[PDB]
Design an enzyme around this catalytic site. Structure first.
Site, PDB file in Angstrom:
ATOM      1  CD  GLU A  35      -2.864  -0.831   0.092  1.00 46.39           C
ATOM      2  OE1 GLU A  35      -3.029   0.199  -0.804  1.00 46.39           O
ATOM      3  OE2 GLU A  35      -3.912  -1.609  -0.076  1.00 46.39           O
ATOM      4  CG  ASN A  46      -8.655   6.638  -4.269  1.00 44.75           C
ATOM      5  OD1 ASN A  46      -9.057   6.775  -2.817  1.00 44.75           O
ATOM      6  ND2 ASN A  46      -7.760   5.789  -4.424  1.00 44.75           N
ATOM      7  CG  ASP A  48     -13.876   7.938  -5.238  1.00 43.05           C
ATOM      8  OD1 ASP A  48     -12.602   8.299  -4.938  1.00 43.05           O
ATOM      9  OD2 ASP A  48     -14.550   7.159  -4.444  1.00 43.05           O
ATOM     10  CB  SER A  50     -11.815   9.182  -1.879  1.00 45.45           C
ATOM     11  OG  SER A  50     -11.426   8.202  -2.943  1.00 45.45           O
ATOM     12  CG  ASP A  52      -6.400   5.397  -0.944  1.00 43.66           C
ATOM     13  OD1 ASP A  52      -7.733   5.481  -0.334  1.00 43.66           O
ATOM     14  OD2 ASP A  52      -6.284   4.380  -1.762  1.00 43.66           O
ATOM     15  CG  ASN A  59     -10.913   6.123   0.030  1.00 44.72           C
ATOM     16  OD1 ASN A  59     -12.144   6.206   0.197  1.00 44.72           O
ATOM     17  ND2 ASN A  59     -10.108   6.266  -0.939  1.00 44.72           N
TER      18      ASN A  59
HETATM   19 CL    CL Z   1      -0.991   2.175  -3.572  1.00 37.81          CL
END
Ligand code: CL
Ligand code: CL
Ligand code: NA
Ligand code: NA
Length: 129
Positions: A35, A46, A48, A50, A52, A59
């Site tokens: 991640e 993201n 959309d 949003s 992370d 998120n």
């Molecule tokens: Cl990532």
């Protein structure tokens, strides 16, 4: 802060992730690797709108408030910036709510695609925990 593998494994264990909801420590370390590359300051936008945040790429659509994700929630009741701290407490506490939500660690697409069903113990091998 960029953690080493064993350093993060130890911090995760101290913060209560070892076998939390049945997920061994290696699962959490593997998820963090893919991640964020173990970097607490990692952020990624993201499609959309949003974002992370942090070592577990939590998120803003659901879990934290960043002030710029329309229509989102803040289920961990924290600013998303708290998830970027060198102190992983906020990330771990929020991750515990996420993994308890019904789909387990499948919430983390990288865990599902890159860690699930693999020898995750490898991630903690050699570590003095
Ligand atoms: Cl990532
Ligand atoms: Cl928002
Ligand atoms: Na907004
Ligand atoms: Na589960």
């Amino acid at each position: 802060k960029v953690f080493g593998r064993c350093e993060l494994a130890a911090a995760m264990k101290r913060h209560g992730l070892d076998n939390y909801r049945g997920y061994s420590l290696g699962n959490w370390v593997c998820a963090a690797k893919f991640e964020s590359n173990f970097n607490t300051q990692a952020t990624n936008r993201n499609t959309d709108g949003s974002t992370d945040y942090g070592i577990l790429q939590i998120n803003s659509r659901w879990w934290c408030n960043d002030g710029r994700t329309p229509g989102s929630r803040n289920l961990c009741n924290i600013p998303c910036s708290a998830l970027l701290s060198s102190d992983i407490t906020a990330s771990v506490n929020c991750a515990k709510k996420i993994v308890s939500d019904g789909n387990g660690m499948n919430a983390w697409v990288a865990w599902r695609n890159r860690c699930k069903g693999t020898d995750v113990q490898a991630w903690i091998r050699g570590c003095r925990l």
